[PDB]
């Protein structure tokens, strides 16, 4: 498994809508390129994908959907951890077919 050190999390945009209306960016430092299993440890926010490609560049992105005004959840990438908190604005569409 790749060794992940100093993992930080920031949220680009958030909108608590039924579709996946969140963009999440992770910074990390690695030694080798591999595959990590990404999970979120709360049901306030639901990630879209299960595995991500970690590269020597030091940036991966994830998509999450949330329904709370201000989420706060702990996301893990292989063995690392972080705390992401964001501010989300309501969506404008009244009704959706999904």
């Amino acid at each position: 498994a790749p060794t992940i050190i100093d993992l930080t999390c920031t949220v680009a945009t958030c909108t608590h809508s039924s579709d996946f209306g969140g963009v999440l960016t992770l910074t990390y430092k690695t030694d080798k390129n591999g595959d990590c299993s990404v999970h979120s440890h709360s049901n306030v926010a639901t990630l879209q994908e299960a595995t991500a490609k970690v590269k020597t560049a030091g940036k991966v992105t994830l998509h999450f959907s949330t329904a709370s005004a201000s989420p706060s959840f702990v996301v893990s990438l292989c063995s690392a951890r972080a705390t992401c908190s964001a501010s989300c604005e309501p969506p404008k569409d009244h009704i959706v077919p999904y």
Binding site: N33, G34, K53, K55
Partner: protein, 121 residues
């Protein structure tokens, strides 16, 4: 650096070692896209550019100043760099004012500005 028993090198000039699983996986994991070259026969892959002719060239041959697509599609929508409309390009690729070409001073580090071929002397 010889790559580990389960890693392959991204070409003879790359220090990048990708997992053997990342060769022909449909993502450009090599800096050159060489991992996606020579996979599905000619089947264009993520490290290859689709010519308008239907030919696959390496993405490294897009905007290299050569017609590798045989239809010039690889040289369409690029961005060629040079000196400004008022600058002369030395053979060392430095830009000097056009006013400093053939003024009997060596402003180019190689004296290209004072070159007998350029000055028409």
């Amino acid at each position: 650096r010889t790559c580990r028993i389960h890693e392959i090198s991204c070409g003879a000039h790359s220090t990048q070692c990708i997992p053997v699983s990342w060769r022909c996986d449909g993502e450009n994991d090599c800096d050159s896209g060489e991992d996606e070259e020579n996979c599905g026969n000619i089947t264009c892959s993520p490290d290859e550019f689709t010519c308008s002719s239907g030919r696959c060239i390496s993405r490294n041959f897009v905007c290299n100043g050569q017609d590798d697509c045989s239809d010039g599609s690889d040289e369409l929508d690029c961005a060629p760099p040079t000196c400004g409309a008022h600058e002369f390009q030395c053979s060392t690729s430095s830009c000097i004012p056009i006013s400093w070409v053939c003024d009997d001073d060596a402003d180019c580090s190689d004296q290209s500005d004072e070159s007998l071929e350029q000055c028409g002397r």
